[PDB]
Design an enzyme around this catalytic site. Structure first.
Site, PDB file in Angstrom:
ATOM      1  CG  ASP A  25     -19.320  -3.242 -44.940  1.00 60.99           C
ATOM      2  OD1 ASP A  25     -20.142  -4.176 -44.701  1.00 60.99           O
ATOM      3  OD2 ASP A  25     -18.428  -2.882 -44.142  1.00 60.99           O
ATOM      4  CB  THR A  26     -24.683  -5.270 -46.839  1.00 60.11           C
ATOM      5  OG1 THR A  26     -24.049  -6.460 -46.348  1.00 60.11           O
ATOM      6  CG2 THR A  26     -24.702  -5.275 -48.343  1.00 60.11           C
ATOM      7  N   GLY A  27     -22.901  -4.275 -44.112  1.00 63.75           N
ATOM      8  CA  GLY A  27     -22.871  -4.171 -42.674  1.00 63.75           C
ATOM      9  C   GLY A  27     -22.553  -2.770 -42.202  1.00 63.75           C
TER      10      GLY A  27
HETATM   11  C1  LIG Z   1     -19.096  -4.731 -37.574  1.00 62.28           C
HETATM   12  C2  LIG Z   1     -20.167  -4.100 -38.467  1.00 62.28           C
HETATM   13  C3  LIG Z   1     -21.497  -4.090 -37.697  1.00 62.28           C
HETATM   14  C4  LIG Z   1     -19.802  -2.649 -38.786  1.00 62.28           C
HETATM   15  N1  LIG Z   1     -18.576  -2.513 -39.572  1.00 62.28           N
HETATM   16  C5  LIG Z   1     -18.641  -2.914 -40.974  1.00 62.28           C
HETATM   17  C6  LIG Z   1     -18.024  -4.304 -41.195  1.00 62.28           C
HETATM   18  O1  LIG Z   1     -18.443  -4.754 -42.484  1.00 62.28           O
HETATM   19  C7  LIG Z   1     -16.498  -4.320 -41.114  1.00 62.28           C
HETATM   20  C8  LIG Z   1     -15.811  -3.574 -42.250  1.00 62.28           C
HETATM   21  C9  LIG Z   1     -14.299  -3.645 -42.128  1.00 62.28           C
HETATM   22  C10 LIG Z   1     -13.547  -4.488 -42.947  1.00 62.28           C
HETATM   23  C11 LIG Z   1     -12.166  -4.610 -42.746  1.00 62.28           C
HETATM   24  C12 LIG Z   1     -11.548  -3.765 -41.840  1.00 62.28           C
HETATM   25  C13 LIG Z   1     -12.269  -2.885 -41.058  1.00 62.28           C
HETATM   26  C14 LIG Z   1     -13.643  -2.842 -41.222  1.00 62.28           C
HETATM   27  N2  LIG Z   1     -16.019  -5.698 -41.159  1.00 62.28           N
HETATM   28  C15 LIG Z   1     -15.514  -6.384 -40.127  1.00 62.28           C
HETATM   29  O2  LIG Z   1     -15.481  -5.985 -38.961  1.00 62.28           O
HETATM   30  O3  LIG Z   1     -15.103  -7.632 -40.500  1.00 62.28           O
HETATM   31  C16 LIG Z   1     -14.585  -8.489 -39.464  1.00 62.28           C
HETATM   32  C17 LIG Z   1     -15.799  -9.096 -38.730  1.00 62.28           C
HETATM   33  C18 LIG Z   1     -15.820 -10.541 -39.196  1.00 62.28           C
HETATM   34  O4  LIG Z   1     -15.012 -10.615 -40.352  1.00 62.28           O
HETATM   35  C19 LIG Z   1     -13.941  -9.713 -40.098  1.00 62.28           C
HETATM   36  S1  LIG Z   1     -17.606  -1.251 -39.164  1.00 62.28           S
HETATM   37  O5  LIG Z   1     -16.414  -1.283 -40.049  1.00 62.28           O
HETATM   38  O6  LIG Z   1     -17.346  -1.251 -37.719  1.00 62.28           O
HETATM   39  C20 LIG Z   1     -18.428   0.284 -39.525  1.00 62.28           C
HETATM   40  C21 LIG Z   1     -19.208   0.895 -38.571  1.00 62.28           C
HETATM   41  C22 LIG Z   1     -19.882   2.085 -38.898  1.00 62.28           C
HETATM   42  C23 LIG Z   1     -19.856   2.627 -40.181  1.00 62.28           C
HETATM   43  N3  LIG Z   1     -20.576   3.710 -40.526  1.00 62.28           N
HETATM   44  C24 LIG Z   1     -19.035   2.021 -41.128  1.00 62.28           C
HETATM   45  C25 LIG Z   1     -18.333   0.876 -40.765  1.00 62.28           C
END
Ligand SMILES: CC(C)CN(C[C@@H](O)[C@H](Cc1ccccc1)NC(=O)O[C@H]1CCOC1)S(=O)(=O)c1ccc(N)cc1
Lengths: 99, 99
Positions: A25-27
């Protein structure tokens, strides 16, 4: 490998003697794994995104094997809906985004 | 480009003639933009993130430039920490993860 994004980029990791599936996860700034035991000291942290924040335990100097590549760094542990390998560990395996 | 992950992979996007900053997010299935006006009708969608599920507005077939690459596809609008470019549009511009 070269991984396309037609589906979630899931890989096998080894952490704490345990095999798990995790999302590259690049995000994500930091790696967050579902509840498990890890050695050493920890401190609480809040991390957030879509749907708000969760409380996690921050462990430092944790070794993870990520699709065959070893890396060391911080691992957050808590009620994440999915195991996430974040930038802090993807940099160590040389992962890049290319287009 | 080849984007390394030592910093957040923030790029410029263009939507509705406006430049915005967005995060290339391989952990996001979908593309989610901060509140703005988009044309056409929308439909409801629930998305899940680290803190739980939220409702967003789904707009289809929206033209968006991502780091100078053209995409046309689904954009969600709602409460998001940052503009997120998810896999649905990263695939269109040819992005892959490599290590
Ligand atoms: C929102 C971004 C900026 C940050 N997140 C990463 C994202 O990749 C996040 C990963 C994820 C996937 C599936 C379930 C839960 C989480 N995907 C996400 O929300 O997918 C949604 C937005 C559209 O498609 C669906 S995080 O999980 O909040 C996060 C925050 C801090 C740390 N240290 C690690 C993780």
């Amino acid at each position: 490998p070269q991984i396309t994004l037609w589906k979630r980029p899931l890989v096998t990791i080894k952490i704490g003697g345990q095999l798990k599936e995790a999302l590259l996860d690049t995000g994500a700034d930091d790696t967050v794994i579902e509840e498990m035991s890890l050695p050493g000291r920890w401190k609480p942290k809040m991390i957030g995104g879509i749907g708000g924040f969760i409380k996690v335990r921050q462990y430092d100097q944790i070794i993870i094997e990520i699709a065959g590549h070893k890396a060391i760094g911080t691992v957050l542990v808590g009620p994440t809906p999915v195991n996430i390998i974040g930038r802090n560990l993807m940099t160590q395996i040389g992962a890049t985004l290319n287009f």
